[PDB]
């Protein structure tokens, strides 16, 4: 009866895998961003005449 | 008979998840805006010759 | 959490292919935008500073 054909067991399986993978991808993105920051700290401090 | 196909229980579950997600998104937006403000306070005070 | 019930209405396969296309476009946009700057371009010789 579900419009996707999933059986509430396939749905739970996919939800577990997908949530874990999204969190994993965000985590490796965080680590890559930290490495880039050590290469180029991209948010500079406020320059002297800035208002 | 619902227009969305959701039962009453699924409507309530979706409502809880939707409101939680929206509130968390807006709260992290508030926190992030504060952090950005510490980086760049974007609304400058009224300058000297401003009327 | 009943969040998994989302996949009873969204067809994971189609969601994933659309998300893949969107994320590819955004990543290309960001890479190109950085390469269009002097400060954060990592391909070219450093320009824009003495």
């Amino acid at each position: 009866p579900s419009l996707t054909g999933l059986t509430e067991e396939e749905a739970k399986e996919f939800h577990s895998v997908f949530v874990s993978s999204m969190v994993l991808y965000l985590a490796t993105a965080v680590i890559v961003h930290y490495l880039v920051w050590t290469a180029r700290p991209w948010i500079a401090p406020i320059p002297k005449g800035w208002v | 008979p619902s227009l969305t196909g959701l039962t009453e229980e699924e409507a309530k579950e979706f409502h809880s998840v939707f409101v939680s997600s929206m509130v968390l998104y807006l709260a992290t937006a508030v926190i992030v805006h504060y952090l950005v403000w510490t980086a760049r306070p974007w609304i400058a005070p009224i300058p000297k010759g401003w009327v | 959490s009943a969040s998994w019930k989302l996949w009873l209405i969204l067809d994971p396969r189609r969601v994933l292919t659309a998300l893949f296309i969107y994320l590819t476009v955004i990543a290309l946009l960001i890479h190109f935008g950085l390469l269009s700057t002097n400060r954060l371009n990592w391909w070219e010789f450093q320009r824009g500073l003495p």
């Binding site: 985590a27 961003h33 930290y34 700290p41 | 997600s21 992290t28 992030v32 | -």
Partner: peptide
């Protein structure tokens, strides 16, 4: 010298980090 103690580094960490937490703590 870009380090972990650079204050502005919290801005990218905050935008990337905060949702990753509650994404894992709400939908899961």
């Amino acid at each position: 010298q870009p380090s972990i103690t650079d204050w502005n580094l919290w801005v990218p960490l905050g935008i990337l980090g905060i949702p990753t937490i509650w994404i894992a703590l709400l939908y899961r």
